[PDB]
């Protein structure tokens, strides 16, 4: 039954329109002599932003996720990549992207738009292989930022130097690849907007700690995506600020995403994009997903707050730190990105275990549903150790197997039955707890 | 017949007995090492025996709670060896960063193998092509040295590091000298014999291994060859450490004359450069080594390395042995295949689990040999 007031998000249409405009801008970039580039959502996109306000990216994973939402087109793309000769168990986003390039079809209409260069971050092994194939097929320059310097908590001066010095190489690379002169003012503005957008996304997620949750994770998938498109843009930073104001007002008014909220769930990585209806099904039980380390920190950037809680990282200028020159901005930009929570499990899965346990506590989670995602080695490494750590903690936890991009490795019927069994389990545990504490 | 390589075969079969007895003789610690990028010079200088974790190629169920089955058989087989207690004599465990899947073996091992007393993860740069990687790795190697000095309470001096580097470089040079014999029309060293030698290099005391390599090379000039060469094959892959499988290949009418794999050439290929700062010499040797696919970007330098080896050893056919789910090698495979075929080398693809019936692979090898016999 509906205990809480509920309301649709007012900025929904704007969130959808900003994403559509991003994809249309990439395709139309050349009409007015713009620059186009491609790389991961984890690329350090403020660097190409130093080349102008008409520099448009296509981030590889969000594009592939958009394709995966169209089951037929995703299958066609994967079939083209397989025809070239790639193993079907490679990253499903990478296979999709490759296939769509060979088919020469853009998901939003027209030919697959050729990027002027590749600007990539490498932490997952597939990060290089993805764009090595692309750069060869498109005959374009390619640059890779190796961020593999170990956990942020162990960072040394020399590790940060390695990343910072590579970024200086990246500046020289984008100047040469584009023929344009890099502008320090535009670069610094872009670093600052990326700091704003990623910290503010974390601030928004932190508002979900309250009961009732003002946002449900399925809705959040249309909001966390903006930082995966252009976190260093003014439009993304400004929209995050606007969205924060709306979510604050929902909290202030007691607004629930799910009016019958009785169960709070946490997920993990990469949901199967053509099967988001599972979230609506869970709503019928009064279950809301409050998020995941993935939704919160694929791009969100976090810090420990004065009360020990997790919140958006403090912007350097609110801490008395000046950013008035290229070299300072590069080193602060490298440090900001190296603190990304979703990079840490590449080195030490217990860091992610502890992060998940902390989310469970601070977001008042009743149960955890973990996707064993066969489509993504990078976000799945360590997943079984994370499951074990949650299991030892006493929080109910279940797994389901799937693949975020390739429906052939996702069993809708079995997964729904596993989730329904989990809702039953959570009800039984509540009955037992009530009976024991009277 | 002549049993020249029997010592290497014994060392392989009895690797664990060897390590236990090594501890009795020297009083040193044993360190389980993962991935061939481990800076073993540092461990030797610290008085320890590096022993590379490898799988057993037998059925195992102990890793299912620790590593999801979308990951490769090698990383699971390897972890199972620790969970089953087979490395209980190793006080340390260390991994130098490359493939992300292997990092799970290390993570689960340090958390759950109860005989581990210390662990260390070396974040070696992946982008060895970057002008900044050698400085970064210099500092990583130095930091590991400081760690080991702190752990053992004994200063690890430059002289100690230089002596360990000399031992490792001699091993690398001796293994390359052994490989030279494989270029002959009737090789005096089979691919199986080369594999026993190059794999055992990774878990036998290098001083003892070098002595055995020197004896082997002293015997090769006059060693009698009885078998026919058959087709000249190259094996390509990640680890490729199933010697029993390689023995089948060489029994059907072929010789494996060279390889691109971490059981073999990719481990030892280059010795360090002469250099007065021993940390730089060590760090740069690993950065300059033929690259793991994970470390091979932006350029696929591996393609030139593999093709150059194929031409220098007169390869007639190349066999890709791939672990199921192996992303770094899967990412390189379609275009490395094309590069070899465009340069006149037909290729064969075989995929492996932890265990595999040999019958199906032999049928494929025999059919591949029939193809070579036509063009
Ligand atoms: C487009 C999408 C796939 C589907 O969207 P939708 O499901 O929302 O469908 P829709 O057709 O657009 O709209 C219909 C819905 O709108 C709802 N509604 C209406 N008015 C509403 C209101 N006022 N407020 C709220 N809601 C309102 C209606 O209820 C209706 O929903 P319903 O039928 O269930 O009732 C969306 O989930 C998305 O963008 N995901 C992100 C994908 C991506 O790119 N991710 C980044 C990947 S990067 C990555 O993985 C890595 C990076 C690096 C390293 C490794 C990994
Ligand atoms: S496997 Fe995952 S982390 Fe790696 S390239 Fe694919 S989407 Fe990115």
Residue numbers in the entry:
A (entry chain A): 5 to 442
B (entry chain B): 2 to 376
How does the study describe this entry?
An alternative to the classical Birch reduction is provided by dearomatizing benzoyl-coenzyme A (BzCoA) reductases (BCRs) from anaerobic bacteria. BCRs reduce their substrate to cyclohexa-1,5-diene-1-carbonyl-CoA (dienoyl-CoA), representing an ortho- rather than the para-dihydro addition of classical Birch reductions. Architecturally, the heterotetrameric enzyme complexes are composed of two functional dimers: the ATP-binding dimer coordinates a subunit-bridging [4Fe-4S] cluster and serves as an ATP-dependent electron activator, whereas the catalytic dimer is predicted to contain an FeS cluster in each subunit and the substrate binding site. In this study, we heterologously produced the active site components BzdNO from Aromatoleum sp. CIB and provide a first X-ray structural characterization of the catalytic dimer of a class I BCR with the BzCoA substrate and the dienoyl-CoA product in van der Waals contact with the catalytic FeS cluster.
The structure of BzdNO in complex with the product dienoyl-CoA reveals the identical binding mode as the substrate in the BzdNO-BzCoA complex. The dearomatized ring of dienoyl-CoA remains nearly planar; only the C4 sits slightly outside the plane. Instead, it catalyzed the reverse reaction, the methyl viologen-dependent rearomatization of dienoyl-CoA to BzCoA.
